[PDB]
Design a protein around this ligand. Structure first.
Ligand code: 6CN
Ligand code: 6CN
Lengths: 257, 257
């Protein structure tokens, strides 16, 4: 039997970051993660402020921000705390353990100092998670494993996807769920976040493929939709985010019965 | 038939970046790529200057440099031209095409502006290469595809590796070879670069595995060794680099006949 997000937030084995996320999703009636793929700090902060009430999470690509500074991230955290959403840096860590630990803690971005969540590819084997958790666990962070991808020709299928699920289950002190196109784990403590989402059918011309909120939340069992251009390219971004939120939320309600 | 680097530099289908590399390898008698895994720009530059004559390539992780600026990269380019080596940013692009094109061109690092070579994971499908190609093709850059990894539990095996090779063959205007543990293509226009190399046996505590230069270049047919800690942890990094250069070069001379 399917548990509500609010019930899942209280599960004995729930990770604290997942619990915080699930509580705010239930409170705000949102399972929408905004992909804020912008090149200017001022745009990132403007979108975070305007759309924060509608989202459970803001997904960043800090390596595309032309004017990144750590002060920009302090301010983004202020917005996150005010509007109540988590920050997910879509770094897709994919190196050996010794390297990802430095990529996560250090350099100019100091990602672990501000991202509630990050993600990682499972291709290197479990050392990728072991390296990240050395940094993440003291800093009370979580990680999502990339179990499937939305893009055409993705090799994250079959036994690869199964390997991701097993890695997550063996590292549940740090891994809180998955980037996937559908539910891949039956354990309710794991979150499923699904990119490649738009209301209408289609793709882009660099291999992105889209499915609808109803398909991915309702039929495929995922928890959260990740939406970028579907919102950002709209004339009215506030209305667009509300359309996506209401779509994802009602799809969740229906599955829950 | 085993061809010399200098001969391969003249192959009909050879990418200009690959030709430049193969020519300097021949001239300098080096098939060593230094993995300059350091956090200070002053150390990176001092290594690049001192070790420049011994190496064919310097591999960077710019996202671990605490004091990155584009001025540091300007000075690295100057040393690369002075000493004749290529700059390889080990970014391991691994996102959909629309994203990676921005990650390569933009942000604070502006990687395309200074890196001769970058690498990509093939797990997203060929959109990853298409996205990078939009930026790198006119700049005469090249890309390496990650066909195998050195770390324990690596999923880059079997049909995954075969997919990487197919993708390289289908995008040979931009893809110039592979990160792999052994020869994966018999096409001599492709470079093979192999990480997880130390003179001594072992690994690290986070999944890295090591094989010797003789094994990797001599028995497994790779072209270039990528060496980090085997050199960087030495008291005298120049002496260490010379030892690795001689090991790798003599192993290559041996399979030539
Ligand atoms: N997360 C993620 C990731 C993996 C995946 O499999 N598919 C994606 O589209 N993404 C990311 O989600 C966003 C998709 O945005 P859009 O909705 O296609 O504009 C991008 O930031 C992309 O890099
Ligand atoms: N290239 C690469 C990459 C992929 C791989 O499969 N194995 C690696 O060790 N690496 C990188 O090579 C270097 C290995 O360094 P070391 O020789 O283990 O100190 C690191 O910068 C690591 O991130």
């Amino acid at each position: 039997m399917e548990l509500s997000f609010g019930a899942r937030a209280e599960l004995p084995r729930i990770h604290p970051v997942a619990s915080k996320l699930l509580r705010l999703m239930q409170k705000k009636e949102t399972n929408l993660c905004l992909s804020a793929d912008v090149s200017l700090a001022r745009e990132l902060l403007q979108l975070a402020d305007a759309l924060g009430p509608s989202i459970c999470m803001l997904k960043t690509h800090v390596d595309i921000l032309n004017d990144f500074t750590l002060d920009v991230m302090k301010e983004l955290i202020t917005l996150a705390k005010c509007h109540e959403f988590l920050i997910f840096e879509d770094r897709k860590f994919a190196d050996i353990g010794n390297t990802v630990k430095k990529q996560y803690e250090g350099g100019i971005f100091k990602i672990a100092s501000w991202a509630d969540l990050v993600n990682a590819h499972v291709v290197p084997g479990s050392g990728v998670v072991k390296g990240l958790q050395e940094v993440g666990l003291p800093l009370h962070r979580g990680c999502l494993l990339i179990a499937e991808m939305s893009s055409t020709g993705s090799l994250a299928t079959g036994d690869y996807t199964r390997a991701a699920v097993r890695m997550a289950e063996e590292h549940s002190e740090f891994v809180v769920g998955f980037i996937s196109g559908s539910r891949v784990s039956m354990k309710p403590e794991f979150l499923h976040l699904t990119p490649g989402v738009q209301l209408e059918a289609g793709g882009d011309n660099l291999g992105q493929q889209y499915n609808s909120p109803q398909e991915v939340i309702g039929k495929r069992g995922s928890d959260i939709i990740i939406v970028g251009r579907g919102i950002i390219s709209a004339a009215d971004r506030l209305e667009a985010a509300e359309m996506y939120r209401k779509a994802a939320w009602e799809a969740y309600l229906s599955r829950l019965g």
